Amino acid sequence: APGNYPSTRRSDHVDTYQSASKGEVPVPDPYQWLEESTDEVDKWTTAQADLAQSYLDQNADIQKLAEKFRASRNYAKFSAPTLLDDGHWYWFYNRGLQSQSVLYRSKEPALPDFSKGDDNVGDVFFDPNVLAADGSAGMVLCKFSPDGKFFAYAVSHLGGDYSTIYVRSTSSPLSQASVAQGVDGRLSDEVKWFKFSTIIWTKDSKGFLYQRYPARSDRNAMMCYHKVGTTQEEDIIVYQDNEHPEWIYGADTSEDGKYLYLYQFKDTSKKNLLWVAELDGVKSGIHWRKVVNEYAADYNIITNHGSLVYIKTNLNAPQYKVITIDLSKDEPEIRDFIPEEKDAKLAQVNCANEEYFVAIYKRNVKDEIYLYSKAGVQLTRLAPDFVGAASIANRQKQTHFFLTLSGFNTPGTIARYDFTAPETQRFSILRTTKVNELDPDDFESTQVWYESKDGTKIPMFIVRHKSTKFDGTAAAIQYGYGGFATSADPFFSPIILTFLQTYGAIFAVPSIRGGGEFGEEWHKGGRRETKVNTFDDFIAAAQFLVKNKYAAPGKVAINGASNGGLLVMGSIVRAPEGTFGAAVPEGGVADLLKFHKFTGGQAWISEYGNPSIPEEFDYIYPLSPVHNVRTDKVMPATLITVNIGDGRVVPMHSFKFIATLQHNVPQNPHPLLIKIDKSWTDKNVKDAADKWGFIARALGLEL
């Protein structure tokens, strides 16, 4: 229980604020000088950093944990494959070295066995890392032509604002081999000024649509059409609007060849227009049937059968739905095809094997996968016990589709559904993620519900190694963010899973208010004047973990970053003594009275309120971690983290908070320390090892 923290000078600096209830309020701010960039601050930072490192050096498990994190750090990433009209399969593969994934082509015209290795079953077709010799050019976006003969790709060099589209034949690889042989085998096509749209081929495979601006703010966008094997001078303007210079455009083409769709956007909401047109291919002076005119709702087209168009929309349905619009009638006949679900956001719909719809719902922060008929009958749920995120990849005419699945236990699993197979054998696993010292199958993701202070029911994710028991024994790592409508969705971290497996601990992720887990009302429920709910939900989660025997008492550690740092710091201030065993806030806000007076501060006003406004000060001040540190409560072992390289949140917040703790509870039984991140395999797990090792020791966990 040492008192040996370095002395922090206390100045006579007093800030004055205005309270709606109390009037003028003088607030002493003796660590105000830590706001400034001076030698005094730099020397105080070194003294604190050195203390922190001295404590970490008495923990020999830090270096042991580092090697385990080094082991599980690297792994390959991949996409689901696509079968093109040339009979070959194409897919992205990243071996885990370079920042850009490489596009592979199957050697044989057949679905590869992906347990053999990507280089054994595939050849490199497009390696974007060699666009520029130094790796300074990136592929932003790409698209194959419907006939499989050509490949369009948008390239962005690090300097430029815009990007440039290029075309190459699918028989012309770009690789380390190919560039060594001589000149790049692309076509001469160089489509400049491309920005903020997809690339959309016509179904004739003759050309593609793309958004472009004039040459050099961004104004007067043009949805254009580029013929393959031509210069940009040969291009057509499909649409522009002189009268609304800020407007942005999207396009789409129907598989049958009949329709060209124009989307129009005016702002950062999801509302959009939808005009429809009939084709021969794409030419100029298009007569647009203006179906969705006026900005009402989100409308994204799924597919069509003749004049019947299927559309995902949120018109009078916040959780989305599917409608049909029949265009053979003179007036379009709008009908509900798949109705809104009250408690399930319709996320994605794809037509599959012509007479079916594959479909993704998010319900209780989890994706569910459904198979529907062309008449809208729900035929079955696929992968019912899956806990995570799912997306669909397919082409409408083919007799299969894929699912890309991810969660806490894996960053990637490709599933295949084969309509031609026997009923019991339609669903299969194409491939899984390989990580040293970690099998995805050893980790179970569940969801439990607890009651917060005001009676609100919050779901919470629990992850464990399968040998760990819910018998009041395990340590728990409780992660949160708690703001900005940013959901704590399932995410993959080898560092965490290795930690759960090493110590028999559990990972706990509560869907606390302030996040986006149940839409804008959920955010609204933990924002500005309701912000205290965010903290009460987080605190009630930790109490629930112990009460219901998920974790042992005194063994729930908390961690979060940026807004999560404020969450952690505010929570150890507010929560009853002994609620938490350890605490690691990373780069967090902590002075909630001054946050808006520093770089990036103003953007947080919509989340916490404005301290300069008297009525808002009154609900802000009682939350401010820097102004609510008591003398008479034992704080849990606390390692505060800041990345001095990371501009985001000024380190001032953490400096003030640690100085305040060390002053208010100098004889605190557990160490209260601040660490400066060494990093702004070998050198990449150093900060994580210090962090997770501090927690393990603080919770009394042995290797």
Author numbering: 7 to 222, 230 to 293, 296 to 695, 704 to 726
Q: How is this structure described in the published paper?
A:
GmPOPB is the macrocyclase responsible for macrocyclization of amatoxins, eight amino-acid ribosomal peptides with the core sequence IWGIGC(N/D)P. Amatoxins are cyclic peptides further modified by a characteristic sulfoxide cross-link between tryptophan and a cysteine, and hydroxylation (the extent of which vary). GmPOPB is an unusual enzyme catalyzing, depending on substrate length, proteolysis, or macrocyclization using the same catalytic machinery. The domain containing the putative catalytic residues (Ser577, Asp661, His698) comprises residues 1–81 and 450–728, and the other domain is a seven bladed β-propeller, comprising residues 82–449.
The apo protein crystals belong to space group P212121, with one monomer in the asymmetric unit. This open conformation has been observed in other POPs in crystal form when free of ligand. The catalytic serine sits at the tip of a loop and points toward the β-propeller domain. The side chain oxygen of Ser577 is 5.6 Å from the side chain carboxylate of Asp661; His698 is on a loop that is disordered. Comparison to the apo structure reveals that binding of substrate induces no significant changes in the core of the propeller domain (rmsd of 0.75 Å over 360 Cα positions for the S577A structures).
